[PDB]
Amino acid sequence: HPPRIAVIGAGPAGLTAALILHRGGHRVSVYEGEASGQQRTQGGTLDLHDDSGQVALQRAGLLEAFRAVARHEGQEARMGDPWSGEITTGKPEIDRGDLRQLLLDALPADTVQWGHSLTALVSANGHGLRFANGVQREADIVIGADGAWSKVRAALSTCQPLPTGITFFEGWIAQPAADIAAMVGQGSLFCFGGEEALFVQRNSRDRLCVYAALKRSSEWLDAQIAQHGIRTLVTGCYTGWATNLRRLLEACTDFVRRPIYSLPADFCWTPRDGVTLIGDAAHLMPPVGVGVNLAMLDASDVAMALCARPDAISAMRDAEVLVRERARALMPDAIEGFQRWFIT
Ligand SMILES: Cc1cc2nc3c(=O)[nH]c(=O)nc-3n(C[C@H](O)[C@H](O)[C@H](O)COP(=O)(O)OP(=O)(O)OC[C@H]3O[C@@H](n4cnc5c(N)ncnc54)[C@H](O)[C@@H]3O)c2cc1C
Ligand SMILES: [Cl-]
């Protein structure tokens, strides 16, 4: 019988896998924890690399669609001196929500099962899935594309992501003043102040995404935030910075706390027939510019294998080796490199 394929997660990995499987004539459902009204809130910017994200879109028949919608407007990465506030200068881009929309727009209406938050995977008739809403399903193939805190990973491993000692505080400037819009430009502004850093990107709707990155223990942040709240704590950490960069920070309405976790480079799970992990589920690592690109490439490796080969279990097993070998080669530099951003 043609296999019942369950994808857990409607991120870039899960949607990329579902689209390649659908186009290969496979029966695929994606189970997404979030309700449909959740895309269109995410608008951070990213670029798809010619050897990963763009390969995945080509495999899914969407490379030209991506090229039609991408910005090719020569977005430059700028550097800011935290103390002088001086800015210097030294790749097809798409907002995160527009990437997810592109994949959703290419899929049949029924593909994604919204409000299906996986709570258990129970293996051998194949694999049982239980959802927080009480729904039960049975699948022959389960692709874990369920992100940093993958429930599918929790079925295969007791190993958890570890804190990096860095937390990003994410803010938005919906209508930047002329001065801060001109300072950031059309692209990115990166400011490394040691244990404080500031990462700003303009998205396709001329909104600024702000990451206030703090090297602080979770315990210290808990105490300070409990007392002062997020906004006061975040702004308080940059009082030694140039006035121009502090104004950029103070223009943010709210901040969300985004602890930066990573799986360890030595991460392993015992392979299980008919179950695998892709993207952040398989190899969550600090945000050094690989995550969406790897997620989509992983999805395309696994989905192509399931389309090309009649032995589904063996196809998945071979694709998993490639996913894991590729990620293990990148994770040490990602983990150590990220730490070196915050050295003093
Ligand atoms: C602050 C920050 C900045 C980043 N910047 C960049 C960047 O500039 N460039 C870049 O390439 N990457 C960046 N990343 C990394 C990137 O966001 C991720 O690597 C990428 O989104 C992973 O895709 P995915 O499909 O594996 O997982 P996700 O995109 O996390 O998708 C997982 C999906 O699974 C769903 N889900 C979770 N648990 C369940 C469950 N139990 N049942 C059902 N559904 C579930 C979630 O709702 C979600 O839709 C950044 C990350 C952070 C934290
Ligand atoms: Cl990343």
Side-chain angles (χ1 to χ4, degrees):
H1 84 276
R4 299 162 302 161
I5 308 173
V7 179
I8 319 303
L15 297 173
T16 295
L19 187 57
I20 294 169
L21 287 170
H22 167 70
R23 290 171 45 89
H26 276 288
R27 330 202 305 101
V28 61
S29 292
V30 180
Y31 301 88
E32 172 55 44
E34 295 311 306
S36 192
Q38 219 52 222
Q39 11 125 177
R40 310 338 248 127
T41 203
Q42 58 192 251
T45 289
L46 57 99
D47 73 291
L48 292 192
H49 305 155
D50 53 22
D51 63 338
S52 51
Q54 289 189 42
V55 165
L57 287 180
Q58 186 158 34
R59 289 167 175 187
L62 283 185
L63 184 53
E64 286 314 298
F66 169 71
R67 274 163 185 172
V69 299
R71 320 149 69 194
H72 309 276
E73 311 172 41
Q75 282 84 291
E76 69 196 53
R78 294 177 179 187
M79 296 292 296
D81 192 277
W83 304 291
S84 67
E86 280 165 13
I87 296 165
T88 54
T89 305
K91 38 143 49 162
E93 298 206 342
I94 185 165
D95 304 348
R96 173 182 300 274
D98 287 333
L99 178 54
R100 255 178 111 249
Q101 198 63 58
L102 196 86
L103 294 159
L104 285 173
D105 289 348
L107 284 171
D110 55 319
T111 301
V112 176
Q113 310 289 307
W114 308 94
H116 287 67
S117 179
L118 187 77
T119 55
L121 170 66
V122 290
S123 298
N125 291 279
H127 306 277
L129 310 173
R130 313 205 210 110
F131 298 96
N133 63 0
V135 170
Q136 292 166 281
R137 295 277 171 270
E138 196 184 63
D140 306 296
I141 305 292
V142 179
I143 302 168
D146 50 336
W149 296 97
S150 175
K151 197 62 49 171
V152 180
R153 185 215 293 138
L156 303 174
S157 173
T158 64
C159 264
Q160 299 288 81
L162 295 180
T164 59
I166 289 92
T167 300
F168 280 25
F169 293 92
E170 180 179 343
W172 284 85
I173 310 168
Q175 257 150 28
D179 62 330
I180 60 162
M183 285 176 179
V184 167
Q186 292 297 322
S188 285
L189 172 64
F190 299 115
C191 309
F192 298 94
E195 293 189 342
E196 304 71 44
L198 189 69
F199 310 127
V200 190
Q201 185 143 216
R202 186 197 292 238
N203 77 5
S204 73
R205 307 226 162 159
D206 298 306
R207 299 175 161 71
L208 303 190
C209 183
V210 179
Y211 295 128
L214 296 179
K215 179 157 174 200
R216 299 292 189 283
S217 75
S218 299
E219 302 68 33
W220 186 96
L221 289 168
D222 285 349
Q224 293 292 130
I225 294 170
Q227 184 172 356
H228 300 297
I230 296 170
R231 184 167 206 289
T232 302
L233 165 81
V234 169
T235 59
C237 291
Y238 294 83
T239 63
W241 280 42
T243 302
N244 60 328
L245 296 177
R246 295 184 56 208
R247 273 190 317 93
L248 201 166
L249 197 46
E250 264 136 45
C252 293
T253 36
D254 59 33
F255 293 100
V256 173
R257 178 184 183 170
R258 296 185 136 87
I260 307 307
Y261 277 82
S262 182
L263 287 167
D266 66 19
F267 177 61
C268 66
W269 73 92
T270 297
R272 184 182 295 177
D273 288 350
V275 187
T276 204
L277 305 169
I278 57 170
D280 279 9
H283 51 68
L284 174 71
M285 77 185 89
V288 299
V290 303
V292 173
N293 278 286
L294 274 184
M296 294 178 71
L297 183 55
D298 291 350
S300 77
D301 287 329
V302 169
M304 284 215 315
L306 286 168
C307 290
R309 291 181 51 183
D311 185 0
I313 274 51
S314 281
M316 274 218 132
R317 264 197 303 249
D318 290 346
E320 187 181 291
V321 172
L322 171 52
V323 165
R324 290 168 66 168
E325 203 167 84
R326 179 174 47 224
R328 200 155 55 232
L330 300 171
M331 283 172 86
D333 286 345
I335 290 163
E336 176 59 25
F338 188 64
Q339 290 298 319
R340 285 179 187 205
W341 296 356
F342 300 95
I343 237 66
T344 64

